[PDB]
Design a protein around this nucleic acid. Structure first.
Lengths: 53, 84, 63, 86
RNA sequence: GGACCCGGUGAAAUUGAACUGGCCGUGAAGAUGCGGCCUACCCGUGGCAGGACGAAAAGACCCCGUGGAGCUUUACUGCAGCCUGGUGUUGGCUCUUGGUCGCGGCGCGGCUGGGGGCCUAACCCUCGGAUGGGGGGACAGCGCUUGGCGGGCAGUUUGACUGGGGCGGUCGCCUCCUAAAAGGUAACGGAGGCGCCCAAAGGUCCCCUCAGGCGGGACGGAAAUCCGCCGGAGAGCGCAAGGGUAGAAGGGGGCCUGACUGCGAGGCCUGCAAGCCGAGCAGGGGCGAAAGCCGGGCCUAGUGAACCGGUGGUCCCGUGUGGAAGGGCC
RNA sequence: CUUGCCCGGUGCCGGAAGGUCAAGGGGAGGGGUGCAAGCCCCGAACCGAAGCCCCGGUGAACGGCGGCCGUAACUAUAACG
RNA sequence: GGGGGAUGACCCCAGGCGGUAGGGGAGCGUUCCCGAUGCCGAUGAAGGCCGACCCGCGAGGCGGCUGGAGGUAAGGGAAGU
RNA sequence: AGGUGGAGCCUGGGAGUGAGGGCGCGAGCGAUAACGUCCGCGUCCGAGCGCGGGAACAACCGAGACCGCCAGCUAAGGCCC
RNA sequence: GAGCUGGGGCUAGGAGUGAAAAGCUAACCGAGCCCGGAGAUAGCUGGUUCUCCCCGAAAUGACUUUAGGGUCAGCCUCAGG
RNA sequence: CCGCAAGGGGUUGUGGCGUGCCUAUUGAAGCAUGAGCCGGCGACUCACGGUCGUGGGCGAGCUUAAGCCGUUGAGGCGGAGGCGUAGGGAAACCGAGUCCGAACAGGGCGCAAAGUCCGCGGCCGUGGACCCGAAACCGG
RNA sequence: GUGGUUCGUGGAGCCAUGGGGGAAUCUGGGCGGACCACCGCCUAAGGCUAAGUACUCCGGGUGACCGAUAGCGCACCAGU
RNA sequence: CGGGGGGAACCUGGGGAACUGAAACAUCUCAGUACCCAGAGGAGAGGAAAGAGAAAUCGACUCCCUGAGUAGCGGCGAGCG
């Protein structure tokens, strides 16, 4: 998107490998290297999910 | 989505009822115990299901759909081209 | 003699015996769009009427 | 390379609110009453409003849809006599 | 000296046509021809300029055609020429320092880089009286690629709005008012906001009852902090307005992330594309005992076609078959 | 008769030690097919040109060459500040 | 449009009918190619000159005068109308 | 519901203008100024919505022009010349 | 006298010449003239033909280097259901 | 004056009602332009495509180029092809079913209604292509 | 570094060449589109070659081709 | 002994462009066209394959139809094809 080194930075998150990812917008603003949550890659379902990229 | 040149392969459109019928007029040849392979309308024999196999006949061609080949078994045979 | 924006003929295009023609959804995606998900579920195919006349025609013949 | 002031001059753009389907017509599982999208429809007609009483829409199917406060979200069912045994 | 009367000769632009008066009114708003009226016989020649919007010329001043042509510079690009590295017909002899890998070091080693020298057989030039000498000489001329300057020139371009062109403004999108009460409409008509953001204003489960005013006491004399009364919520909600609306969206705490994939019956607005809504169906969770809610936010702004490409996934294509460059799909 | 003041930008003249950077040399390393010797590319650390950056000189080279408040001034800049 | 049309036509009434861009239907003469078991004319081809029969019409026919040689197609076709 | 009667709906070929004004009214601007412009509701004209009227005057009041010269009632508007 | 001149010639028309205004280059060179691209393009301008029948337009809205163009809609017309 | 006689010819004295004609125009008599007068030239055409409508030959319909036959010269053979015979999909491929997907929720289609060649037309593209109109660029 | 090719710098080959390196003579040497294995094709870096298609100054034939402002502009002391 | 000079049109080589389309215009198009040059002929062009493609299939060159407005080239736009 409109890449603006302004606390506005786009990122994703793997599925422990579940394989690929899924969309997400972000803001250093707070918690830098902070970013985790679960989902479900083509890999079965669910799976921890770090976001960092 | 198109290519950087040519290439390509092949195959055609030949189907059920289609035959049985217009092939009913195909009886002017191998339309007895029927060794199909016209020679009249199309290019690269394929067999479409729909309809209801019949005229009990073995067909020297490429292939066909599910049912078709099935129905086929209804009352006939099925031979494939070159090597299969 | 004749041809056709062969183009559009390429991208978005191609008719059904019905005498009608269609090309892939075409909301946003495939450019900018961190946007959302469900929105994703927003790319199948879109059939615009009227104009699809220039189209079809201009293509006419092979497609 | 900028813009000026003391020229207020600032036209406004377009909307498109309505009551679509108004009150008491052939009811179709589709956009009920509108004046606040993202809306959260309801059940049958609506009668709650910054006015007092209520409104029936002698039209019944799945559901309709609200407008956020205005009108008055549905809930006071009202399938309509035209919802009995065929 | 023409002009005027005679005799001889004898054109020329413009012109629909016409026997063409003044008035005061009128019409597209400066009329012999339309209305009312007043003067009004038919023709002519010598004249005098006012009107026939007289003649000349499809305004040169104007704007409009994403017309043209000339000059300009820190407009765009490109060429001419000029500078420039390596390379070639541009051959010898010696003086030298640098790198490097191997066996701060030094010894060696292949490697290879810089450079200084008369020469000299190309090359060129030189001539000066012949083809030999002379001068320079590895130059350079000059060929090929590099790069650079480069308006000298060559070709295009330099928006729209605009109650005259320009200067001035202004173009998107959110709200009010304008819209006469369905919807919806100009105005360079009014006023005001936006190209953010919030990982926790997210999802639920559990609790709360506002501003304010009055009365009573610490640090306090506007303006807290607590205690006791009054309250169609006038506070409250990140941001502009407007609707909302405590029952609450609104104030806390508990765990929780669906701020989901596959989809969506069926509608709103709509020439286009968009834009926007949504039960319910399946897989898989979260919150609650559960009946249920969860597919981000209270909303309506926080925006962009399609192509031109990157990258993580596919293992669909793979141009004799085995593959990969490369391509399609996510 | 007399041409004064400014080289911060610009053109230019000089400098070339240092940054940069083209073609290029020159090797780490990866890649495809390869039974294997091989056989094609991507290749980068460093060396590497003018130019540009940076130092200076440059005006009968382009070009430019301040503002307001106070003060003897019975009144006005001004001699000063 | 509708009431019976024998091919015409005839009767009712409904029912209008002003119209530029522009849309649909129907007709007219112009020079040619048929000669769909077609040919006129020296007592005039045709054009011309003039007219109080035929048609809504664009045209027809037909009669009088002129003038030296042509060409007409009852029907369909074509186009430098 | 429908007295109506003749508009309606879908598919499809062929289009034109893509900038108008004038009047009444309700609003905007504007000196509530203009034969000013700007949006709306109806009409109006459209180079023929050709004729009557208001002298004359598209245009405002009445009127819908298939055709019939020596018929008849009226509209609006008029009737001393 | 950078004097006027005849005769002989040289240069040339994106190029010449020019004691230099864009002057002069076979009587209008801001880039000659003839033939050729070629009947260049030309939202602009005109011009745009025989009769007759039938109905009957818009001068708004949406996007445009688009505003005196034109796309799509809206209003026309004919064929069938 | 009555070669179409009791009806008309021609000319007008009066009176009666009357703004020419073309383009572009909100609107025009025009004082906006167009034209002095007459005669002849002079402007929506042809080709290949495609596109609907219609006249008709077979429904699988239809013909290139050529070979032969040709007062008139007489057409007749030629079966590469191309449109319909399912389509759905980027594709693999499947197939009256298919793609998304792991789900029976929708998109395209099935359902024959079947064309096809030709003729003649209203049009659409390439064409100088409704007709003339300029300033300019480029070659010799 | 250009060409032609449908290829407009592209995953981009073949053939043709502007500059510089400068192989092989039959297990040789290009080729079948980057490349590589294997298969399959072909044998260059000299030359000649009628016939099948194009064009009308010329001569003929034929015309739903013209008729003196149409046809070539010019039907006859016209490119004068 | 041969040449050279011609010659409407046609042929290959040598060299070789803007308009205009893309509704600008730098890529692109018109095109390898128009023009100029040289030269062969009555015809030149070309012509027994280090060719084509892939069914182990085809074979001189040329030209007509077809392949095909397909495979495909591209500010994937106008077009070229």
């Amino acid at each position: 998107a409109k890449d603006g080194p302004r606390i506005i930075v786009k990122m994703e998150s793997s599925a422990g490998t579940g394989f690929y990812y899924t969309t997400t917008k972000n803001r250093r603003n707070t918690q830098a290297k902070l970013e985790l949550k679960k989902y479900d890659p083509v890999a079965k379902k669910h799976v921890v999910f770090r976001e960092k990229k | 989505f198109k290519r950087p040149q040519k290439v390509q392969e092949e195959a055609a459109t030949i189907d059920v009822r289609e035959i049985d019928e217009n092939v009913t007029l195909l009886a002017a040849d191998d339309v007895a115990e029927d060794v199909r392979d016209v020679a009249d309308d199309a290019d690269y024999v394929k067999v479409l299901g729909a309809g209801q196999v019949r005229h009990e006949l073995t067909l020297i061609a490429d292939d066909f759909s599910e049912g078709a080949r099935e129905k086929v078994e209804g009352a006939g045979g099925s031979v494939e081209l070159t090597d299969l | 003699p004749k041809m056709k924006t062969h183009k559009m003929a390429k991208r978005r295009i191609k008719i059904t015996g019905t005498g009608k023609v269609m090309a892939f959804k075409s909301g946003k995606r495939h450019q900018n769009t961190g946007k959302s998900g469900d929105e994703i579920r927003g790319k199948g195919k879109g059939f615009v009427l009227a104009k699809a006349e220039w189209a079809r025609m201009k293509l006419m013949l092979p497609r | 390379a900028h813009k000026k002031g003391v020229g207020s001059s600032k036209n406004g753009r377009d909307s498109n609110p309505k009551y679509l389907g108004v009150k008491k017509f052939g009811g179709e599982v589709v956009k009920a009453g509108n004046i606040l999208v993202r809306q959260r429809g309801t059940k049958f007609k609506a009668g709650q409003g910054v006015g007092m009483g209520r409104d029936h829409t002698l039209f019944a199917l799945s559901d309709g849809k609200v407008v956020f406060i205005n009108k008055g979200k549905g809930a006071r069912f009202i399938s309509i006599e035209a919802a009995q045994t065929e």
